[PDB]
Amino acid sequence: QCDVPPNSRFDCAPDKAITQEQCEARGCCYIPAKQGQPWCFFPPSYPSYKLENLSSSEMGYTATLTRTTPTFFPKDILTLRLDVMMETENRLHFTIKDPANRRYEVPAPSPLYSVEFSEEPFGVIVHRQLDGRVLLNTTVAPLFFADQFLQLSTSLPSQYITGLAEHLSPLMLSTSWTRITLWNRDLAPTPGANLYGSHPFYLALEDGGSAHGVFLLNSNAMDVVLQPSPALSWRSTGGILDVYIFLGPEPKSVVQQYLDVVGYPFMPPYWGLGFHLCRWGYSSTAITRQVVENMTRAHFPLDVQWNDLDYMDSRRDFTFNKDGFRDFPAMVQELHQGGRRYMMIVDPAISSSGPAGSYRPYDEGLRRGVFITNETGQPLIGKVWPGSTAFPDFTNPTALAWWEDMVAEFHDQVPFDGMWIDMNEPSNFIRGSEDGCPNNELENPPYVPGVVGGTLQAATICASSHQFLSTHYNLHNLYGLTEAIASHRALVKARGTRPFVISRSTFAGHGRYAGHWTGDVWSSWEQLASSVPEILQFNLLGVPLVGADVCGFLGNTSEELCVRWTQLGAFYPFMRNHNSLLSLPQEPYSFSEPAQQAMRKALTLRYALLPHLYTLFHQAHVAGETVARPLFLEFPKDSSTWTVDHQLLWGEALLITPVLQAGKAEVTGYFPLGTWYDLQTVPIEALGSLPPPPREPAIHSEGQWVTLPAPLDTINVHLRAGYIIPLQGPGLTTTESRQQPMALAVALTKGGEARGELFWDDGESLEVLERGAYTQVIFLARNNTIVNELVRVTSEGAGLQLQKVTVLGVATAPQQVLSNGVPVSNFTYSPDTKVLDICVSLLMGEQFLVSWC
Ligand SMILES: *[C@@H]1O[C@H](CO)[C@@H](O[C@@H]2O[C@H](CO)[C@@H](O[C@@H]3O[C@H](CO)[C@@H](O)[C@H](O[C@H]4O[C@H](CO)[C@@H](O)[C@H](O)[C@@H]4O)[C@@H]3O)[C@H](O)[C@H]2NC(C)=O)[C@H](O)[C@H]1NC(C)=O
Ligand SMILES: *[C@@H]1O[C@H](CO)[C@@H](O[C@@H]2O[C@H](CO)[C@@H](O[C@@H]3O[C@H](CO)[C@@H](O)[C@H](O)[C@@H]3O)[C@H](O)[C@H]2NC(C)=O)[C@H](O)[C@H]1NC(C)=O
Ligand SMILES: *[C@@H]1O[C@H](CO[C@@H]2O[C@@H](C)[C@@H](O)[C@@H](O)[C@@H]2O)[C@@H](O[C@@H]2O[C@H](CO)[C@@H](O)[C@H](O)[C@H]2NC(C)=O)[C@H](O)[C@H]1NC(C)=O
Ligand SMILES: *[C@@H]1O[C@H](CO[C@@H]2O[C@@H](C)[C@@H](O)[C@@H](O)[C@@H]2O)[C@@H](O[C@@H]2O[C@H](CO)[C@@H](O)[C@H](O)[C@H]2NC(C)=O)[C@H](O)[C@H]1NC(C)=O
Ligand SMILES: *[C@@H]1O[C@H](CO)[C@@H](O[C@@H]2O[C@H](CO)[C@@H](O)[C@H](O)[C@H]2NC(C)=O)[C@H](O)[C@H]1NC(C)=O
Ligand SMILES: OC[C@@]1(CC[C@]23C[C@H]4C[C@H](C[C@H](C4)C2)C3)NC[C@H](O)[C@@H](O)[C@@H]1O
Ligand SMILES: [Cl-]
Ligand SMILES: [Cl-]
Ligand SMILES: [Cl-]
Ligand SMILES: [Cl-]
User: Fold this and answer.
1) Alpha-carbon torsion 621, 604, 669, 578, what sign?
2) Rounded to an integer, what distance in angstroms lies between the CA atom of residue 772 and that of residue 793?
3) Which of 150, 152, 619, 806 could be a cystine partner for 625, CB 3.0 to 4.6 Å?
4) Which residues line ligand 3 (CB under 6 A)?
5) For the CA of 375, the nearest ligand
6) Which domains, ranges and CATH numbers included, belong to the chain?
């Protein structure tokens, strides 16, 4: 009865350290590990729920679940309702609820799945129809459903699982008795800790390169325990079990299927993809202007200037100080005149200590009842930057209207172009409130997940505090998401164009409203390497607008780290160099000449690729695609890609192999089966001085590891054969770069074929796709010809000038190159690199044929 294989033992004492006699009193097995693995575990006969009255409906199945024996948790719910909904051929949905009480809820034609049920003990079993593989099997462990403890377990189809943000972790999670805690917490990224966001979704790989996803729509504090059997347990402290299974079968379809439920990523403004520069320490408009002057003088592109707390009067939202920032409005107007945008920090918490009538955000907030309240009905008061603060309740419709007013009124004074929303966990410098927290079951729950500080109140507000929709106990993990939604709506109403919101704290569905940065990362080689897995993870979770503070945030960067960090960072979909108050400068212009050259090249390559990056965001927005994706998403059938997380792809075609260690002049990277062209063979124009010329022009891979030259001034980037990439001429801003002629990079297959596309619009209007205010073009290389295919042509993109076509993998020098049947003014062929470079005078929006032979 206690003869359970060690790796299949499920913990019967997750609540407390337990003696043998207590363990056996619970009706559990006690076998000490020989060296983690639980000593106290469930026998296969431990009491669970019994399935009763299973019935067929027109959507799927309904049943009653009955527990006859209570668990060791208080307030077992002995009668549950099961609903199974076969929603699409790709998406299965099942809920387990209390039929007696409404509980908190987060606000061959054939399906790819089959579902069967275990009667006693109760379990859901989901097979993949095609190969009979078991994806979900909840029979492996008892179902627990108590007022403040849900546990649902399943076998996993392999040792390969990714998701469950936000943690400092490899892309593929360890199944060695790993506890993953989802409780939004302000903490500098460190391993084994709950960080700023919670995404209760995983993607599981199966032998052969199929995959499925599971989403638990639950916003309560929870542990996810992985064991080596392999298996997984969801342990939540409230709500209901609301479970979605996505059948894929391709990993990219899993991600698309998940985003069909939580939302497709928002379309950023084009300028949002340029270079951002920030720090705490730009303590006046004069110093802030000097940053732009210094970047401009050294030929470094800069689209967006930011300010941290510096701009505020006494660290209060919707103010500016009359010392260093007296002429704030004029500074932001000047930035706009020069073709740049402005971003500034906004904190959730609102200063509560000012004299009444002297601070409108608090005075208005108090009048409209916008704030989170405590037991006695008064605003819950914490401590953040301004001192004593109340916290807005972004679940309250009146708070959304108040937020829109405060943003619009401040925007009438200073025309900021977006919002950087920090501290939205929400973060508290004290525990709970100025008045502590009451002694109740929400503040002291029977199961506390493995949160840093061992309490739900640590570095945040009281769990029993009141919000419009529910207690903070249920809503905490949404707080940042609700502010991102509020801020997104505020900016649409204020500016009338696409909003740009960067948020620290996130929940599943965040990407529909805002982007993310990975927070207070150390300026270390370790945190540099760790940023690639984290950026890839947020792309799988539908938050493609993500990056880490380029050169690191905490501590002092070195010159070499900042060169390597700027090289990889130029391939973050969101690229911002941000620096702590206590740190040495790390602006690109503050380094030695050779270091500036390397940094200038990385920024130049990024700006050249912006039309391609923008098109990748269009695909994310319209089809639920990833922008930065791991190799395994593009090559799931090659099991060598599965654990690769120190390389990334942009879309299908661009493979980035960064150096992530000090003292290295080479890097070993994995190259999936196919030809990979070195991007160094494509000509790129820069406004300033670039590094001097130093490698193999093309890598012919069978699926293998390849060592590449990677000197300090180099990052390895390869273009996949069979893809065409649109590029645009240089600029110090996107305002300048968008006016430049465009170029095509055509990577020919062995058979002489390639395909690509360009999406173009005005770069910031709302409702572009619905109004049809865009141009979409496809490029096809075949039989020594390149043509464009006009999917849509409008005023926006009509007069795009194509002036350069670079063809990679051209075997022999051509005797003639034609543009629309006429010999071209000029072309060069390199027999060494096999590159054909062609000057042309064509329009993206007008049919052309370029031919050679
Ligand atoms: C819900 O939130 C509200 C805030 O919105 C919060 O109100 C606070 O109540 C405490 C006391 O319970 C107040 O503290 C007082 O501060 C004044 C000075 O401003 C002092 O005179 C008071 O001192 C008396 O009590 C002390 C006990 O420590 C004695 O040492 C002393 O000798 C006095 O007898 C007292 O410290 C606080 O000012 C308000 N906050 C605000 C901003 O009004 C309320 O308590 C919260 N409810 C719960 C249940 O947490
Ligand atoms: C879903 O997971 C459950 C639990 O892991 C699996 O059910 C278990 O299956 C094993 C192997 O079939 C059972 O052991 C066997 O039982 C038979 C009959 O009692 C016995 O003759 C064999 O010698 C063997 O011991 C085990 O009892 C059973 N557990 C329960 C609680 O039913 C099940 O296989 C999984 N379902 C699928 C489709 O994978
Ligand atoms: C399982 O269902 C039976 C039968 O319930 C009836 O048929 C169902 C399809 C549905 O239409 C119900 O509303 C009906 O009541 C339940 O057994 C019945 O229990 C009720 C109330 O105790 C009683 O009036 C009847 O005599 C019972 N009928 C029979 C034939 O046994 C049973 O309780 C359900 N099980 C659970 C745990 O909910
Ligand atoms: C980050 O560096 C600062 C400053 O370092 C000093 O100045 C630089 C030009 C460089 O040459 C360093 O080697 C210098 O030491 C550090 O701030 C120092 O803090 C200590 C107090 O702990 C103080 O005695 C120094 O004078 C400070 N210097 C200044 C100018 O403030 C800071 O500690 C470094 N941070 C980390 C985490 O290493
Ligand atoms: C912008 O660049 C200027 C010029 O390099 C910097 O001003 C110099 O700063 C050094 C210290 O590094 C001083 O010793 C010099 O007196 C300054 N020179 C001039 C011409 O003013 C300035 O610090 C940079 N500003 C920012 C915000 O980066
Ligand atoms: O707006 C101030 C900061 C940083 C605050 C500090 C964090 C560390 C380093 C430094 C000193 C204190 C401890 C406060 C700055 N808030 C948190 C954000 O994650 C930072 O991007 C932001 O710049
Ligand atoms: Cl013991
Ligand atoms: Cl509720
Ligand atoms: Cl391998
Ligand atoms: Cl249309």
Assistant:
1) negative
2) 9
3) 619
4) 52-53, 64, 66
5) 1
6) 6-41 (4.10.110.10), 50-261 (2.60.40.1760), 270-613 (3.20.20.80), 741-853 (2.60.40.1180)
